Amino acid sequence: GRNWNASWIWGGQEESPRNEWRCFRGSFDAPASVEGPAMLHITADSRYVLFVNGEQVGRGPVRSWPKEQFYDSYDIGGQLRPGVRNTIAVLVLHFGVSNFYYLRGRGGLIAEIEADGRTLAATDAAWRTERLGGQRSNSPRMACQQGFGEVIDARELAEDWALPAFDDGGWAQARSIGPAGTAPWTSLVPRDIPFLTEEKLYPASIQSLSRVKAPKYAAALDLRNQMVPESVNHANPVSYCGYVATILTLETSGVVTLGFPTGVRGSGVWVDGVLQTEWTGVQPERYYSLNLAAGEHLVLVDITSSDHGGSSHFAIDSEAAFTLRSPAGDNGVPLATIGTFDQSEYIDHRPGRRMQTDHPDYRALPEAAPTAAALEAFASWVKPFEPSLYTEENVFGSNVWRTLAERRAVPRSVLNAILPVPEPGVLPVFEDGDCELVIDLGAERSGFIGFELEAPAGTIIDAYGVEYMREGYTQHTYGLDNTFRYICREGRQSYVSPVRRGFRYLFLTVRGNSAPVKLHEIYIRQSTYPVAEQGSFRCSDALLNATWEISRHTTRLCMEDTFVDCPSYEQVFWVGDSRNEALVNYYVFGETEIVERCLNLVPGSADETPLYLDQVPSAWSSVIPNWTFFWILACREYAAHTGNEAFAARIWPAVKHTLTHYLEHIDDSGLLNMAGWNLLDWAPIDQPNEGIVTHQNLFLVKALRDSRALAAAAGATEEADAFAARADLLAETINAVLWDEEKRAYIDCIHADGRRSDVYSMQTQVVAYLCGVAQGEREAVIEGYLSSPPPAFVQIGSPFMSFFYYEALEKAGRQTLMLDDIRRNYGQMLRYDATTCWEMYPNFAENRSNPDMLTRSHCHAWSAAPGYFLGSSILGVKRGADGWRTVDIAPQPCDLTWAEGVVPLPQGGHIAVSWEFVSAGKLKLRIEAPEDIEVNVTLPEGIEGEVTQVKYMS
Ligand SMILES: [Ca+2]
Numbered sequence: 001g002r003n004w005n006a007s008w009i010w011g012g013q014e015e016s017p018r019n020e021w022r023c024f025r026g027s028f029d030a031p032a033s034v035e036g037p038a039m040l041h042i043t044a045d046s047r048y049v050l051f052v053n054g055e056q057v058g059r060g061p062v063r064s065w066p067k068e069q070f071y072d073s074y075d076i077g078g079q080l081r082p083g084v085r086n087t088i089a090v091l092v093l094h095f096g097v098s099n100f101y102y103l104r105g106r107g108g109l110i111a112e113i114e115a116d117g118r119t120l121a122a123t124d125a126a127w128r129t130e131r132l133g134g135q136r137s138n139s140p141r142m143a144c145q146q147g148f149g150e151v152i153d154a155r156e157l158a159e160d161w162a163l164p165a166f167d168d169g170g171w172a173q174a175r176s177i178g179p180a181g182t183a184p185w186t187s188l189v190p191r192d193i194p195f196l197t198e199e200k201l202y203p204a205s206i207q208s209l210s211r212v213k214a215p216k217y218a219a220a221l222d223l224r225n226q227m228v229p230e231s232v233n234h235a236n237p238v239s240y241c242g243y244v245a246t247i248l249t250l251e252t253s254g255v256v257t258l259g260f261p262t263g264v265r266g267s268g269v270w271v272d273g274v275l276q277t278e279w280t281g282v283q284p285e286r287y288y289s290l291n292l293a294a295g296e297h298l299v300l301v302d303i304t305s306s307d308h309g310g311s312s313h314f315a316i317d318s319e320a321a322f323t324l325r326s327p328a329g330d331n332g333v334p335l336a337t338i339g340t341f342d343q344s345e346y347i348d349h350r351p352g353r354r355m356q357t358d359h360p361d362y363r364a365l366p367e368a369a370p371t372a373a374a375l376e377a378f379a380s381w382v383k384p385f386e387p388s389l390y391t392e393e394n395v396f397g398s399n400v401w402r403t404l405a406e407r408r409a410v411p412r413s414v415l416n417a418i419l420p421v422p423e424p425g426v427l428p429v430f431e432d433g434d435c436e437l438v439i440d441l442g443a444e445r446s447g448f449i450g451f452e453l454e455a456p457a458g459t460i461i462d463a464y465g466v467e468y469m470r471e472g473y474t475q476h477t478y479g480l481d482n483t484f485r486y487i488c489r490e491g492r493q494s495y496v497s498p499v500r501r502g503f504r505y506l507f508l509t510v511r512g513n514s515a516p517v518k519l520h521e522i523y524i525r526q527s528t529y530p531v532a533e534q535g536s537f538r539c540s541d542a543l544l545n546a547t548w549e550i551s552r553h554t555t556r557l558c559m560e561d562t563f564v565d566c567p568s569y570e571q572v573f574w575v576g577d578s579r580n581e582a583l584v585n586y587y588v589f590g591e592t593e594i595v596e597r598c599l600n601l602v603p604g605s606a607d608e609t610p611l612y613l614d615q616v617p618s619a620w621s622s623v624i625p626n627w628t629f630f631w632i633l634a635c636r637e638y639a640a641h642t643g644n645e646a647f648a649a650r651i652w653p654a655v656k657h658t659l660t661h662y663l664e665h666i667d668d669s670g671l672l673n674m675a676g677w678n679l680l681d682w683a684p685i686d687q688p689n690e691g692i693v694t695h696q697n698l699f700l701v702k703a704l705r706d707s708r709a710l711a712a713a714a715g716a717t718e719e720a721d722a723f724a725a726r727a728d729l730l731a732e733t734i735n736a737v738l739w740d741e742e743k744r745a746y747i748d749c750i751h752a753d754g755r756r757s758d759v760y761s762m763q764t765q766v767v768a769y770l771c772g773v774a775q776g777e778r779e780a781v782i783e784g785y786l787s788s789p790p791p792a793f794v795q796i797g798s799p800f801m802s803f804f805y806y807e808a809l810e811k812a813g814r815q816t817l818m819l820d821d822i823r824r825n826y827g828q829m830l831r832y833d834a835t836t837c838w839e840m841y842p843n844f845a846e847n848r849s850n851p852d853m854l855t856r857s858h859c860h861a862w863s864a865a866p867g868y869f870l871g872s873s874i875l876g877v878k879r880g881a882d883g884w885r886t887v888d889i890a891p892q893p894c895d896l897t898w899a900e901g902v903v904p905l906p907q908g909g910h911i912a913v914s915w916e917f918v919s920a921g922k923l924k925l926r927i928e929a930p931e932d933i934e935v936n937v938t939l940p941e942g943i944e945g946e947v948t949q950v951k952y953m954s
């Protein structure tokens, strides 16, 4: 790190407020001249947006474990005004709630400008601070994995708060928290990757315009934090038992519709003590029709369930007037919760008490309190709803359930809204209803939504992004409030959401405006790890070219400050996914720093568990054996790719440490037996959280062996011999126990009660093949399955698993089968106009809100296999020695007539290869690479040809 001369500062009384955006301003007189570069070092909790003299300079910090809080260093020489007063402005977003990429600490900002060994500015009590005006701290929690979707009322926002000439005389002074090193940020460590990109991209088209209406009542509730207040300090799943209650009063008799955008969490809904047995809606949505008479009615919604986090939705609509009020003491929120009768926190790798649903009051309450009066007998359980966890400004619910949706032809003028032209797009004003615009980016993107417009004060601008829609069907992001609401001040204004969102289609809905709104522009500032299209692949098969294209795009969008599973739902660095994502990255982009950064973050979870977390740095203490095994694989692959022995030495201890503890989980049977999340694929694999799951037993063998490479590269090869012995013992036990003679294949698992599974999957067989556990006769048998998968076996359910399958086909020399599989499986994605690779394949019920959905996430880089295999298995480019000191060129044209591509090299430069058949059985091949790289060339079986090898200077 560095020695700081600045102090962590914050403002307000609460140390860690929920969902609060706070502004900071600091000024200083810059010297007439400065020799060296003027560096600005900064970090914040939770995230920040930096401005220097009014100009937005950057965002951060990168995700960190509070123990090693990463700080950024910017060269601000470009924004610095020599010899005069300069202004530093910062917007700090403090979550006040833990998630999958942030561990709750406390609000704070620390920044220091240094030049020529002298401190020119530093955060301290002299700085000014105030909450961002109009930012509602009760806005919806975005998702169990992320932060919050914002609601901003610009009428209360000081637009020029970041400008040098802004008058902050009335702003309170900031409060010092302490010097660098003050808890909870034990140490401040320098950002270990370059800065992310941020490029303004305009949309491709306007898909539709509609006159619409949201439900009279729509609210987003954070039931997790309301029912289990302490859950704000972690991101583990919790379960609670109880109800949501409100008194519905109708001025006159009429029909009322209860809407549940995300469904009913518990066993059901009760009205006046009567269980509503009828309802409509496409899962997970549900709507109830109530034919009520004038008067008061007690509505009780059972919410007993497991809740990982995120907003729960409740809506009501009727042609009749109605009011709502809490059965408890008035506090502003018309709802109350009853409970918490029982609860529990789930740590998937540790035993723990589970919530029960037999509490006597919970069971009797519904029917025992048909009125608010009768509810008095349960008064001790009726609690008010915490205001900050409740909001009626619900963009998601207002989009999922539209009481009116009337398509209108798109006026030419409106198109101007997505074009970089001077003429604005004038939106039509409907006499009765809102104006909904569906903006199509043309492809999935990830970044910050921005716009500029002119509108009457109070006009509501709602934004909601989705990944997929087709012919009247919109796949809503259930579980993700991918939204923001902006309320207009008078006149022209601009806004850029500081919350990252991933989506392809943006529902932009304008409400409450009396006069026409002029949309000057709507766009997205895409942001990813700095990648250039240095790698490439094209061939005679246009379908394969398209699969490569979406694989490359998917990888790009899943590369932030760390690799992430997806840009929409989570934006989380999942360890398992990163192994495949890194390999694809090597072939399509060639970046290495992001890979090492990710590999280095994993050991930081050692304090939580020696088995290591499946996603980091996170507050969800969760473990998936295979993910940790894939981390070891990724470490080996990274060390071999770069030839970075220093890294191998640094990481070896962490590798040895975790493997040592996994071995302790092998019992009498001599097999890995664990009580936890024993996952591999999203398919009907018999992989119980119970005992002996075959696939992870197989990967442990390979992990134990793969570890040697790191040990040897680290210069301590002997420290891995013990693991090598255990691998043999394990492999033998596996072949001795987990194999079925009659079926001639490995069983999925052995249950806790010792019951051997009768379920057979392609997955387990593929893994046995790749891990080298299946040898001789059994190997040949597995190879038969590879070329002809038994339809009776469980099938591969995700392109993630397809990746491992392709590695097996490569090992078996079945490249043509690999190509046909890619054509079929990725071709189906393209059929539905995919611009990125799907998380899972269609027709599998796992991991999705509705079994009819093609997939949950439409952009998961763990599914970008073609980006790696086309260049490696087909074009023919493979690493031949660590650090690519030698390269093996062995094309496998299969049924292609030509192909060409480029693979970047970690040391710089690239490997360019092109080939085409000039006549039957005869190829023309060109190879270009740096002169110091040895090239081994092998034409495919029975093929002759002309090879042109070109070497250029390093
Ligand atoms: Ca314009």
Ligand SMILES: [Ca+2]
Pocket (backbone or CB within 6 Å): 950, 951, 952
């Ligand atoms: Ca030459």
